């Protein structure tokens, strides 16, 4: 900061930094909601299970990109554990990764789809592009 | 002149590049985060504006899903992922530049590598990971301003390795199975014998390929090399794609900057009203920001719907050129590039497709005297195909698109009526192979 | 013009468009297909029509054996275009309504300046004459927001209409290539028959 | 009937007119003059709305340049300005009109 500047704003007039008036240190301000989150679901009335995609978050960072200490326990279940899967489009949690490719049911992105699939689970997989074939030229 | 005709004595194989946009950035907006900026008080006021945010998110979700349809319906036209053949030269035609190269891990062709280098993305890619915006003072960035205001780009469903996998399959089938690839299960054909069939599709006799095949292959190879030399040195060929990138970047940048507007409130900064005014009278100021910001956001969604319809119209056209130019041979003039269409090869490009149109171009035309009909013995003979032509001493039939003079036999011609009716009839002899 | 609305002239003046027309018909009259595929190759026009009859699947003789009838029918049919264009009032309706729509859009935009939008007056000088900044600015903002909203409407409508004109322009460009520079097998693309 | 066919014994040459729009009037708006007239006071308040005017002018400039594309891509398809032939009748076909 400049020696007399008290806060900083970006091109959006979002106040992104502030000088602490007591210590004179500079604090960054981040939005509470930061980043995109999207919920995978089959229909309600087929399962209440869901999976969560943290659209640009790194799977070890999910417990901090989400403020998992401030969340309810029922959400914090979706912050960690088994069934984390680092896709592109960020970390997917709550769907088990499966090595069989299938036609795309729910399009998650960056090559990944998910489906409610055989108990049943939400499973995530890479799309099959098509049938493998060769021409005996 | 009413009695002379120009026939091409030669031809050139031309390869022509057509660049088509197919998709745009799958933009997404957290409408509450944009308007009310995490403040709880404003969010209560935004509830009193009802369903506007839901309707805006629904619209942008339609745009996004449609971008995958556009990409799928262009590239995923072939259900069979015909793997790249081990040998890249067929009959002398060298496909090595448009097929993938196993010398690299990326399954792009060499041409596609140039295409993916020749366009620069405004973010260099969708990622700006969680920690990356909390940077130095110089590290302020319009992309971080976008994230802090709830604006994001979703990645496409098909990754570039998948688009390149489809184009590799399409060129592999085209290199090895011709038209049948579009009509059904791809049927193996020798490529020179496939090109011979495509010459008949022009109306050049099948021999003209085999009788010149080494020249034709050399011209094809050189033309593909001239594409590569242009795509390395050019700065403008993919402008139809870079300007789609630029337009969508600029639309988001103006949207975040529009948060700096006051819209007639005492301040552009929502915290600054809430800091400074009581709820009795802040709400009057907050409402001006809510309505103004919400108006700016609906402007963006409307123009995206406009731009998406334009891209979708372009994607439908690219999907038509894939079917008509790649999976077959098109009689539609200038549809599959200039010249008579022979073949097309699809190549992937960032948010687009590139068609290498291969066409026959007639060259070195020569003037000949010509006649509509021959009168042999009081009855008029017409060409079955082509035109009667005189080389100066002797009358022949030739095909129109390539000078190949043939003896005027009773096979090349059909007879109709006494030869008095046709104006410009001439008296040359018609040879009958039986009589000698 | 007083309110800042203007029409810019087209880049190609009508004499330049007419010059391209003249070249296109001249090539069609003298070189046929070759005009599209490459350097245009001279062909006698009766002999070009004979080829275009084969394109239908009518044997080449049927032209030469009837050429005077065909030429007369062609000439009369062109004359019937002239006689109808001299006497119709509606054949170009698809163009007159493109003129009318864009004129009407501008006329409603200037008339929208007569709106108050809930200000004390539609007239900006009248507010500024009558009120002090402390409270003029409230009234001025109601005019600014309403007027700026009226521009955003107009520009949206133009973007919609321009997309429609693209579709027609791309189609007309396709008919130039497929119908003028060639012969089309597409059943009903270049007119009936 | 399963065993009879109709064959045309004759034909008519037809000429048909298809009318197509290709461009529209290129339009330009001075967003400041439209909103504020000449009043300096209103122009200062309009600055507090920022880029709306710039964004509107950019949009209409896109329309305008696109109208020249539409005309060029229809008519300028041939690079050769083949001069009009001196004789307007070929084989009996009278191009003079
Ligand atoms: C068409 O023209 C090309 C050149 O414009 C001819 O190809 C050349 O032929 C000579 C003699 O065979 C070679 O020495 C050259 O290297 C060739 N160059 C190229 C670029 O092909 C070709 O022979 C002509 N075709 C016909 C049928 O006459
Ligand atoms: C096909 O074309 C290439 C030229 O593009 C020929 O040469 C190869 O070119 C690539 C780069 O383009 C190099 O990485 C290779 O090392 C080149 N190989 C050789 C032997 O020069 C290639 O040989 C051609 N293939 C055939 C079968 O003719
Ligand atoms: C098709 O019909 C037209 C008339 O509708 C025929 O033209 C007439 O032919 C007769 C005899 O040749 C002349 O007496 C008339 O004056 C012609 N009329 C016109 C308007 O040209 C024409 O011959 C018919 N076509 C065929 C192939 O039989
Ligand atoms: C071609 O058509 C015209 C009719 O439009 C024939 O007649 C001439 O037409 C123009 C107007 O288009 C008049 O100014 C001339 O005075 C007309 N001349 C005559 C002699 O009628 C014209 O003769 C036709 N040309 C040919 C070669 O047949
Ligand atoms: C008071 O302010 C001064 C100067 O900002 C700072 O050094 C100090 O730590 C603050 N608090 C106390 C208890 O002195
Ligand atoms: C986390 O991000 C780093 C780079 O910031 C990357 O190397 C790593 O792969 C990411 N996490 C995972 C699980 O891939
Ligand atoms: C999927 O395959 C990979 C192959 O490297 C393996 O590491 C992984 O354990 C497999 N997962 C399952 C669920 O089979
Ligand atoms: C064909 O004839 C015309 C007229 O004499 C002449 O101008 C032209 O150059 C000739 N073309 C060739 C290829 O001989
Ligand atoms: C015309 O073709 C015949 C082929 O038999 C040839 O003998 C003659 O020399 C040719 N004339 C010219 C002028 O090329
Ligand atoms: C061609 O034109 C000449 C005059 O240049 C004329 O004598 C001849 O009859 C015409 N023939 C044809 C078939 O047009
Ligand atoms: C063609 O032959 C007939 C009979 O020999 C003759 O009457 C006619 O004049 C000839 N025409 C030409 C152009 O030689």
Numbering used by the authors:
A (entry chain A): 552 to 669, 678 to 696
B (entry chain B): 697 to 1132
C (entry chain C): 843 to 1035
D (entry chain C): 697 to 793
What did the original publication write about this model?
S protein initiates cell entry by associating with the major host cell receptor, the human angiotensin-converting enzyme 2 (ACE2), via its receptor-binding domain (RBD, residues 319–541 in SARS-CoV-2). We report the application of ancestral sequence reconstruction on coronavirus spike protein, resulting in stable and highly soluble ancestral scaffold antigens (AnSAs). Cryogenic electron microscopy (cryo-EM) structures with high local resolution indicate how an intricate network of hydrogen bonds between the RBD and N-terminal domain (NTD) maintains the AnSAs in a closed pre-fusion conformation.
One dataset of each protein was collected in one session and readily yielded 3D reconstructions at an overall resolution of 2.59 and 2.77 Å for AnSA-5 and AnSA-6, respectively. Both reconstructions show the ancestral spike proteins in tightly locked pre-fusion conformations with all three RBDs down, which was the sole conformation that could be mined from the cryo-EM data. Similarly, the protomer interface between RBD (monomer A), NTD (monomer B) and S2 helix/loop (monomer B) is stabilized by hydrogen bonds between sidechains of S815 (S2) and E273 (NTD) (A854 and E281 in SARS-CoV-2 S protein) as well as N274 (NTD) and Q534 (RBD) (N282 and L560 in SARS-CoV-2 S protein) (bottom right). All AnSA sidechains discussed above that confer interactions not existing in extant protein are conserved between AnSA-5 and AnSA-6 (S284/S286, S386/S388, K226/K228, D46/D46, S815/S834 and Q534/Q553 in AnSA-5/6, respectively). While HexaPro showed a clear interaction with soluble ACE2 in an SPR experiment, no interaction could be observed between AnSA-5/6 and ACE2.
